[PDB]
């Protein structure tokens, strides 16, 4: 419901239970994601929130909180 839909997206994408998707968790080092999963993760967030995340911003979205912060700061 809230902007914490980011958590649900990370869960479905990386196949991780919503209980393990913590704010301080990083996709690669904490949720077993590779560089192919993260490309899909950024695109998934792009489709969910009707936003365009350019390359220089997508490179900074490596943790769950970073993803919540970018979406909250872009309507």
């Amino acid at each position: 419901t809230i902007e914490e839909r980011v958590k649900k997206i990370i869960g479905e994408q990386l196949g991780v239970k919503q209980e393990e998707v913590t704010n301080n968790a990083s996709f690669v080092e904490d949720l077993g994601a590779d560089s192919l999963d993260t490309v899909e993760l950024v695109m998934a967030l792009e489709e969910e929130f009707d936003t365009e995340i350019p390359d220089e911003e997508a490179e900074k979205i490596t943790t769950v909180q970073a993803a919540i912060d970018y979406i909250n700061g872009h309507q």
């Binding site: 590779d34 560089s35 192919l36 490309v39 899909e40 950024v42 695109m43 390359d55």
Partner: protein, 84 residues
């Protein structure tokens, strides 16, 4: 020398983004699924000349996707029953 990793990830994103613009459901779902499966299947290739062969093949298919997406938009039709 060009970076193979930087190339592959940039090609991966551009290919998926472009395939999502297919109007036809059967081409769109196939391309997105095929790209995701192929990049994953070739993830552990080590031969640098085998990777360059795959990279070039991907660049060629990205041109195919770009052209076929456009002509599929010029000659579009209604969606299928399951897209409702």
């Amino acid at each position: 020398a060009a970076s193979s990793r930087a190339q592959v990830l940039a090609l991966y994103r551009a290919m998926l983004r472009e395939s999502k613009r297919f109007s036809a459901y059967n081409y769109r779902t196939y391309a997105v699924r095929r790209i995701r499966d192929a990049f994953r299947e070739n993830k552990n290739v080590k031969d640098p000349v085998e990777i360059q062969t795959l990279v070039n093949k991907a660049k060629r298919d990205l041109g195919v996707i770009r052209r076929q997406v456009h002509i599929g938009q010029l000659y579009s039709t209604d969606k299928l029953i399951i897209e409702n």
